[PDB]
Amino acid sequence: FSLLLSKSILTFFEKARLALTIGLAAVLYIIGVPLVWNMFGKLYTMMLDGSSPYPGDFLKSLIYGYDQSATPELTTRAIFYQLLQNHSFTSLQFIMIVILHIALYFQYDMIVREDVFSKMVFHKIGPRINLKLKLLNVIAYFIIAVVFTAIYLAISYLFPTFIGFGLLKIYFGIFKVILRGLCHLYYLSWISDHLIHDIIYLYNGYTENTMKHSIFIRALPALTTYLTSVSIVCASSNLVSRGYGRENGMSNPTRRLIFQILFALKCTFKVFTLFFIELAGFPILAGVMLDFSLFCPILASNSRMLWVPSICAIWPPFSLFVYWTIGTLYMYWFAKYIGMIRKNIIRPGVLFFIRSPEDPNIKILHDSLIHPMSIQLSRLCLSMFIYAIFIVLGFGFHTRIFFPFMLKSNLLSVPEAYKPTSIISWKFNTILLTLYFTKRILESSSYVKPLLERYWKTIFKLCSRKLRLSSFILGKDTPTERGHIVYRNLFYKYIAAKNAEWSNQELFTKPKTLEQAEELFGQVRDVHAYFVPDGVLMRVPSSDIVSRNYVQTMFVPVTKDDKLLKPLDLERIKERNKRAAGEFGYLDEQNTEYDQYYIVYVPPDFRLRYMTLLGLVWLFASILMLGVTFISQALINFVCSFGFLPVVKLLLGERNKVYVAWKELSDISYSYLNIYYVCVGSVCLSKIAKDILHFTEGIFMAIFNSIFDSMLVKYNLMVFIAIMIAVIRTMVSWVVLTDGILACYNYLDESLLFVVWIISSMVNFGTGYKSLKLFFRNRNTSKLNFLKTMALELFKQGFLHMVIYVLPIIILSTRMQDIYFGLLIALESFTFFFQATVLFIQW
Ligand SMILES: CCCCCCCCCCCCCCCCCC(=O)OC[C@H](COP(=O)([O-])OCC[N+](C)(C)C)OC(=O)CCCCCCCCCCCCCCCCC
Ligand SMILES: CC(C)CCC[C@@H](C)[C@H]1CC[C@H]2[C@@H]3CC=C4C[C@@H](OC(=O)CCC(=O)O)CC[C@]4(C)[C@H]3CC[C@]12C
Ligand SMILES: CC(C)[C@@H](C)/C=C/[C@@H](C)[C@H]1CC[C@H]2C3=CC=C4C[C@@H](O)CC[C@]4(C)[C@H]3CC[C@]12C
């Protein structure tokens, strides 16, 4: 036994050495390194200002720094809270810096690898003791990390901030000169005064060093230095490229490499800016207007203007994540709607400007490199403005200017008692989970989308037929749409429209011009209406995937036989193409595989007609959404006020808390908006959708699938079970030790009990990590297999441990004292002996 006993002691020593090396390295690299970074940042800020926030005492200065806590005390608890906050701040800064560097390097690599980038470049320049040893390493690496952090923070914050002071003083002087010139030109109280006050406040805070806490006012000099450096790089690329071209070769190799680097950086910044806008600022601003128009008037008061900032009061930066999420969700749903319309309802070619999700001729990087930044940015701005019109007008009208004022109704406003106030609150979480589960149920159903598509087909056909846009929007039109019916009198035009139409028996048989129609009205009294053809046939693109050059030639009027009514102005088209392109126009090679055109009829006043069509689309979408919402709410309310509530009144009583809660909920629902009722009714109508489809031409299973099949619920449940089993086994272990061995020893210092509790907690967190390992193995398994595996694991490592140790003690709890204590000692000794025997057998 002695030989491999000593060997096992050596293995335990190796374990302990490895555990200590990992633990010390982890604690240092996770705590000290962010704290060393933050202390160096505070020291550099003090050097820049020249004075510490707390003169003389540098610890408090290096602990609290430039914070708003008024004279905080040096309490160990206060110190711990402050250091946690400092660690969070520095972790956020480091994460942001690392992400920015990674994104920029990836953009640089992708652009450099691109072949069209090489073509652009060629166009511009033209052709040519062991434990101790390990620890030593850990400490040495930590010292290297600390000195690297000091140097990097120096070169990245200290010097940039000083150069920022200089450059920002220069720019303030230049701005002052420009303002003086503007005032001279000009010469030769609530809103503006408030804005002037805010700007003067910011300027005084920066210049007089009063705002020492603001992140923005501290980063202003460094940000100015970085922006100036970027501007210099972008301008110097063009400056180096001056003169040289495809004809004038650039012989010098060093200058060639310098330009290659500068141009790569310029393209990196251009593509990064465009992508950052389109992917963050586009969704974030869309979410901001969604908050302004829909969420704030509904989940908050109409008087307020934004709602997400209030619920993100815990950590205001999370409002950006919330805004991005809601904006991205809105854009995804709008893209789905446009996809449905494009797929089935409207003519293929109408929505050519909107980007087609399934387009083989998509080269995002190539287009970002070649097309000028101004043109792409302008297209983004107009698309953003159109999305703003849709969001703000379409939702905010109903939520702000229609229901509260015209109808004087709170039917589109959550009741005061159920308005969420914080993101972590139960109200917000319940609303969000209800919406998520209902969305999952609706998407899972196979009859909702079809019915919706049929509704939109009917709506589009009706609106287009009314506006005489059937040919342009749908592709099929009767000849009656190709002219307006001129009536003799306004009475016949409006009051007697049907009578006047019936009077003319030659209306659609023969076309009459306007002057001829007036002449016939003057001559004859029997007929008071005639058909006057108007509008001209036009060429329109026959597919959504059409080269941008083709679009510039495919909106020209034509005769019946595909002959242009006016000779095409080719030179103007070429000039517009040159403007739409840039120095790199020829490099773009647009594919003409899908460049075909339809000859469709376009009525007069086309712009007004399709604007009215979009207005009618908004009107009918609003009618559909409001009808679905209110029908769902009314259906559930009728079911849950004339249905279950009387039953609860009989069974649960008339004064029970549950009965009062649901009764008040229903009574408010008759006048307010309950999202829960709306969602449940939406599920019910989704079920009725099949019957609706059949006539016009299970529930619990679906709910179960949607709930217990989503990855969110699975992850939440598995984490909950892991925590539960860990805490259960910790309670078992602590109770066993204390109310067993300790009590028996006493029969025969909180610090020690907390220490052993920590040890048991660590070992049982390892036990829980065993279940976490089970999670990954069973992540994709079926619901029944998942539930059975989870139940067996929980049972065995939970209630089995419960029964083996605690329950006999439960039952067991003069000679009877001795019997009790001896029996408990014997059972503990038997368990210890069994464990030791198993370990010895394995050994
Ligand atoms: C960059 C702009 C695109 C923005 C992307 C996001 C917008 C989402 C879709 C909204 C469509 C409405 C915007 C119309 C803008 C037309 C710009 C253009 O390039 O036109 C050139 C063309 C030609 O204009 P022209 O007749 O002046 O001729 C110009 C001739 N050349 C090219 C030689 C100079 O105009 C059109 O073809 C207009 C067609 C509009 C058809 C409308 C389809 C309705 C179907 C419903 C979809 C909308 C659902 C959302 C509605 C919800 C309301 C709340
Ligand atoms: C205000 C300063 C101090 C920092 C600003 C950071 C924000 C603008 C953050 C908050 C949420 C971040 C977004 C959170 C997550 C992602 C997902 C990511 O998605 C993809 O890259 C898709 C790629 C593919 O699948 O092809 C794009 C960046 C983005 C939106 C981030 C962009 C930057 C955002 C908007
Ligand atoms: C205003 C310009 C013309 C003058 C003053 C140049 C200032 C230099 C010091 C600036 C301009 C660009 C800055 C710069 C660019 C890129 C990086 C990489 C990053 O990972 C750390 C910061 C670091 C290393 C900084 C250091 C400071 C630089 C080099």
Numbering used by the authors: 113 to 240, 463 to 522, 544 to 1052, 1095 to 1145, 1166 to 1230, 1264 to 1293
Q: Which sentences did the original study use to describe this structure?
A:
Doa10 (MARCHF6 in metazoans) is a large polytopic membrane-embedded E3 ubiquitin ligase in the endoplasmic reticulum (ER) that plays an important role in quality control of cytosolic and ER proteins. Our study reveals how extended hydrophobic sequences at the termini of substrate proteins are recognized by Doa10 as a signal for quality control.
We also note that the N-terminal RING-CH domain (residues 1–113) and the loop between TMs 2 and 3 (L2/3; residues 242–463) are only visible at low resolution due to high conformational heterogeneity. Our study reveals the highly unusual architecture of Doa10, where its TMD is arranged in a C-shape architecture with its central cavity filled with lipids. In our cryo-EM map, this cavity is filled with detergent and lipid molecules, suggesting that it would be occupied with lipids in the native membrane. As a result, the TMD itself contains two sizable intra-TMD cavities each surrounded by TMs 1–5 (cavity 1) and by TMs 5–10 (cavity 2), respectively, and both are partly continuous from the central cavity. Our cryo-EM structure shows that both cavities are occupied by lipids. Interestingly, cavity 2 is occupied with a triglyceride in addition to a phospholipid. However, the tunnel interior seems water-filled as the cavity is lined by a mixture of polar, charged, and hydrophobic amino acids. On the other hand, the back of the tunnel seems at least partially blocked by a phospholipid in our cryo-EM structure (PC4 in Fig. 2a, b).
